[PDB]
């Protein structure tokens, strides 16, 4: 047995880089320090389909093909397509994402990542009002008040609290005892159970609650005696806790991006954090989901100028979320072909989008059996980033960390698959 240390975990945006992998043959048989989810990715569950070779279905049933045939037919679909959708990206590394941008440019495609079903609304909000953030270490070493707003880290970022709240930092040497922990959620989540304050507000009224809080913050009277199910008196007491912070951090998640108002819930939250800096240092961090969703928006931004929902059909890059987003093209029946990489929209898009996936050619660069492969025409299996392939990923607050290669795989990496698909798309055009 051998123990490989300092491994970076390829699941969620916490992007822990202290994982120990237990390697036996050439295979990862156990972990240390990784949480229950991260461990499940590193280890193979027996009875689980791990595609060993590309597949193509013959109107109704899948047959094994070679890499060159699968890549070739995939290139033909994208070359002939007039509005191809290239979606996913969040669970692979940045060098593959960069090739994807060039390929989307070459195919006149719209390229988009899981941000469009995730923190896309935070992207729209931050473009309109701003983005006051910090890195995890400032939270650990300085944070006096820690808020989890509409996110459930114990189930979705399991080690997030232990690394940022219970940790003993430079100016917070007593860890959990040095911080007031606040959670905002209509459910009594296991994250809420650990809180000093739990605002169990009415669902989809965050925007109303944040409007009252900010009016209070700027010295105004709160119109109604109860807002979002929270009594006026406790609105102000909550604003006083935030005003009296020495260093506050607002972690927020899907409870306010998926809710009514979507990006405008993030908008009002950001502007409160900004204005609070006249009374107390305050900052925010979106709880980005996958380990490298942040990386795609970084790569796509610096190459093209825009972070997601990027449409190259006209040559120039153009950007209108609400127009050029994965769900918009599918539900409005604009997309005439779709390439999925490192994502599962078959499992995780709404019914109305899947209706369109049923009618169009679907390419899936995917290692495992999923609802998307069940809706797929071509399946191309890759080496998995973080276990069998290396590359850069970006943590939820922008910190870049290189994913490590722990064991060998005979399958091709995403980037090599994408470089060959780009080669053939040009040949046809």
């Amino acid at each position: 047995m051998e123990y490989v240390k300092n491994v970076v975990c390829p699941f969620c945006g916490t992007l822990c880089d202290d994982i120990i992998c237990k390697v036996e043959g050439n295979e990862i048989v156990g972990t240390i320090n990784a949480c229950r989810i991260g461990h499940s990715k590193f280890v193979h569950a027996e009875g689980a389909m791990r595609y060993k070779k590309p597949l193509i279905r013959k109107n109704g049933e899948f047959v094994e093909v070679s890499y060159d045939e699968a890549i070739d037919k995939a290139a033909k679909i994208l070359a002939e397509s007039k509005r191809p959708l290239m979606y996913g990206w969040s669970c692979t590394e940045c060098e593959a994402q960069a090739v994807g941008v060039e390929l989307a440019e070459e195919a006149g495609a719209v390229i988009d990542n899981t941000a469009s079903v995730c923190h896309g609304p935070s992207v729209l909000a931050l473009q309109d009002v701003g983005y006051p953030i910090c890195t995890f270490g400032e939270v650990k070493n300085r944070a006096d008040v820690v808020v989890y707003w509409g996110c459930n880290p114990m189930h979705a970022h399991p080690r997030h609290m232990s690394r940022n709240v219970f940790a003993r930092g430079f100016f917070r040497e007593r860890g959990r005892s040095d911080r007031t922990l606040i959670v905002v959620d209509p459910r009594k989540t296991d994250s809420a159970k650990l809180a000093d304050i739990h605002l169990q507000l009415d669902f989809d009224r965050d925007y109303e609650l944040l409007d009252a809080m900010r009016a209070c913050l700027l010295g105004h009277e709160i119109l109604y005696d109860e807002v979002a199910g929270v009594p006026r008196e406790q609105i102000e007491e909550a604003v006083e806790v935030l005003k009296n912070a020495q260093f506050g951090i607002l972690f927020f998640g899907m409870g306010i991006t998926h809710s009514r108002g979507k990006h405008r819930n993030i908008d009002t939250a950001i502007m409160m954090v900004q204005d609070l800096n006249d009374y107390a240092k305050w900052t925010l961090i979106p709880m980005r989901g996958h380990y490298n969703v942040t990386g795609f928006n970084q790569v796509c931004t610096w190459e093209s100028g825009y972070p997601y929902c990027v449409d190259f059909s006209g040559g120039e890059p153009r950007y209108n979320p609400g127009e050029t987003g994965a769900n918009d093209l599918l539900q409005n029946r604009e997309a005439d072909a779709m390439m999925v990489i490192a994502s599962d929209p078959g499992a995780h898009f709404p019914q109305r989008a899947l209706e369109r996936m049923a009618e169009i050619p679907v390419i899936a660069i995917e290692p495992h059996r999923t609802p998307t492969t069940e809706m797929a025409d071509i399946i191309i299996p890759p080496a998995i980033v973080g276990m069998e392939a290396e590359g850069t990923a970006y943590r939820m607050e922008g910190v870049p960390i290189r994913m490590k290669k722990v064991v060998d795989s005979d399958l091709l990496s995403d980037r090599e698959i994408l470089e060959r698909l780009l080669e053939k798309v040009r040949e046809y055009k």
């Binding site: 202290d18 156990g30 240390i32 991260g38 114990m154 080690r159 219970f166 940790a167 650990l194």
Partner: protein, 80 residues
């Protein structure tokens, strides 16, 4: 007598107990600062294969800190 008992089937691997424990903190600065141990250390429990795993129960002083830090009652102080 009352001692530390783990319920791995309920555990998330979140690590709050590992970090919160003062014995662990005292012995491993990485644990004190919220990280999983990378250096070789003898501590009371760690997260291993995704769940809590008790390694040195004799070092446990039964203070109750880890129990408070777990929201899903996966680590406890009970008889035996």
């Amino acid at each position: 007598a009352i001692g530390l008992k783990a319920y791995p089937e309920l555990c998330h691997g979140c690590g709050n107990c590992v970090i919160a424990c003062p014995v662990n903190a005292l012995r491993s600065p990485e644990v004190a600062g919220g990280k999983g141990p990378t250096d070789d250390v003898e501590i009371i429990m760690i997260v291993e294969d995704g769940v809590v795993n008790i390694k040195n129960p004799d070092l446990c002083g039964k203070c109750g800190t880890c129990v408070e830090s777990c929201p899903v009652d996966a680590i406890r102080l009970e008889e035996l």
